[PDB]
């Protein structure tokens, strides 16, 4: 999830399932990895002391100035179009700077995003439609033109760009709590029953 | 422009009492057969207003502070009130509002105007062939950097001088809120000797000017005539008072118009 080489795109992102395992979150503090680690719905420290039933990690990479638009209730070119979190979102936002790796010469075309969308994409939904965005009354006919824009755009990633344009690997941590049996819990040895 | 009048005589700002003056329809809300309470800029009842007048040896055209809003009332015969000048410094250094009546159209412009110390509009040589036509324009010397222009529909205004009772009665409310200028007008014939008559009038809005400038001073425009410092003025009088954030009880009739008001 976090240490993978190349994440999926934020246009179409892979959701990784963490289940039937031991989740040790103290390694994240023993080996310094995360540059920005903040939990909006929970405490970043209590992920180890509190364990969850179904853990879903959404891994992707976006431009730096596009990170702030990802949060519950926010509106922007990210939240409204390609990747949205619910208004009641309870989870953790993790990001760190991959400029030293993901940046390739003039750009990295493996990470795309939706610049144009005809409506507001619902949270936790993936829309792969590339249909030309039509803002006017003239038909686009599948090509760009007057009020016709190709919605699927790539992030410009260069090692010399400023911190606003540098690629940041972003992993959004979502969970389901006390709605099912808990298969994922930390390495706490069980004790005797009294 | 820089020349001051000769027949103009400086007099102290005498004061008079007002009865119900300053009541107007505050907003676009319709109310009928009800008693409503609202707080806005009004002129308090039995408040002290200031008395300025014009006549062939006393002529008044003072500079008065606008603050948030003011109340104006004039008893006229020849329609001597030609308009108002609103500004902060009353100069071209800022953006100023000019509302003037040339007897044909109402001209409302927001420009940088070249201020005259005593603005007025003159008319010349009456005698036979009663004339009454505008010639000299002292309301501004020049105007540049105009951001707003409004010209009303053509009308015929009677500038002829009259004798006896006052044949025109014009009352106005001028205030500026949230960068929107409000004008409330009323015209009703009255019988008045001096000071102010006892009676109710509910002023109604004319236009809304989304100009968005600060007005700290104003003047009321007058016309001068003679059969440009040697002109004379016809008999007329007007009053100015200051609006305060006061609460009124507005009693509405069956038709929806305000019957009477009570100052809280």
């Amino acid at each position: 999830v976090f240490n993978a080489t190349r994440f999926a795109s934020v246009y179409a992102w892979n959701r990784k399932r963490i289940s039937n395992c031991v989740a040790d979150y103290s390694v994240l503090y023993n080996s310094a990895s995360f540059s920005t680690f903040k939990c909006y719905g929970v405490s970043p420290t209590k992920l180890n002391d509190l364990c969850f039933t179904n853990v879903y990690a959404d891994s992707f990479v976006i431009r730096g100035d596009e990170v702030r638009q990802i949060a519950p209730g926010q509106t922007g070119k990210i939240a409204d179009y390609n990747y949205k979190l619910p208004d009641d979102f309870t989870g953790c936002v993790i990001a760190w700077n991959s400029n030293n790796l993901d940046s390739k010469v003039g750009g990295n075309y493996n990470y795309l995003y939706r610049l144009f969308r005809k409506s507001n994409l619902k949270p936790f939904e993936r829309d792969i439609s590339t249909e030309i965005y039509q803002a006017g009354s003239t038909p686009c006919n599948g090509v760009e033109g007057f009020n016709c824009y190709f919605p699927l755009q790539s992030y410009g990633f260069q090692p010399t760009n400023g911190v606003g344009y540098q690629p940041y690997r972003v992993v959004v941590l979502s969970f389901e709590l006390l709605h099912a049996p808990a298969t994922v819990c930390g390495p706490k040895k069980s004790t005797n029953l009294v | 422009q820089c020349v001051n009048l000769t027949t103009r005589t400086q007099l102290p700002p005498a004061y008079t009492n007002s009865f119900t003056r300053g009541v107007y329809y505050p907003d676009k809300v319709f109310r009928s057969s009800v008693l409503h309470s609202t707080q806005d800029l009004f002129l308090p009842f039995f408040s002290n207003v200031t008395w300025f007048h014009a006549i062939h040896k006393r002529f008044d055209n003072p500079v008065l502070p606008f603050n948030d809003g003011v109340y104006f009332a004039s008893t006229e015969k020849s329609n001597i009130i030609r308009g108002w000048i609103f500004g902060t410094t009353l100069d071209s250094k800022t953006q100023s509002l000019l509302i003037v009546n040339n007897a044909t159209n109402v001209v409302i412009k927001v420009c940088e105007f070249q201020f005259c110390n005593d603005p007025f509009l003159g008319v010349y040589y009456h005698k036979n062939n009663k004339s009454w036509m505008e010639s000299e324009f002292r309301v501004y010397s020049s105007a540049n950097n105009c951001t707003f222009e409004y010209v009303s529909q053509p009308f015929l205004m009677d500038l002829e001088g009259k004798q006896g009772n006052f044949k025109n009665l014009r009352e106005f409310v001028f205030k500026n809120i949230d960068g929107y200028f409000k004008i409330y007008s009323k015209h009703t014939p009255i019988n008045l000797v001096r000071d102010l008559p006892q009676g109710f009038s509910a002023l109604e809005p004319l236009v809304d000017l989304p100009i968005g400038i600060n007005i700290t001073r104003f003047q009321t425009l007058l016309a001068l005539h003679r059969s440009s410092s040697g002109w004379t003025a016809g008999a007329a009088a007007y009053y100015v008072g200051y609006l305060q954030p006061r609460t009124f009880l507005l009693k509405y009739n069956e038709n929806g118009t305000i019957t009477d008001a009570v100052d809280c």
Binding site: G73, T75, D87 | -
Partner: protein, 97 residues
């Protein structure tokens, strides 16, 4: 405490998380407003129930029979009462000696 009292004004202006905060103030205030109305109606209703018990007792003691209770049916030695219906109540005309 809300920005504006109009419900649709906040809902059509503020962001979802911000509109929930300001609308919650309208909901709490309007809910307490109705709760205060109900409380006052409960206490005043008990007051009307007390006067209703008095009216029924005066129909028995004053209207129907003769009242030995002193000054219950009014001043004087009571004889009989003539009930008269009234809006949201009843009036007793007590004939006394």
């Amino acid at each position: 405490g809300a920005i504006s009292s109009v419900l649709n004004d906040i809902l059509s202006r503020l962001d979802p998380p911000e509109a929930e905060v300001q609308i919650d103030r309208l909901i709490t205030g309007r809910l307490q407003s109705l709760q205060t109305y109900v409380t006052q109606q409960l206490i005043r209703a008990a007051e009307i129930r007390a006067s209703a018990n008095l009216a029924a007792t005066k129909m028995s003691e004053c209207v129907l029979g003769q009242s030995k209770r002193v000054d219950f049916c009014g001043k004087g030695y009571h004889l009989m009462s003539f009930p008269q219906s009234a809006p949201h109540g009843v009036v007793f005309l007590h004939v006394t000696y």
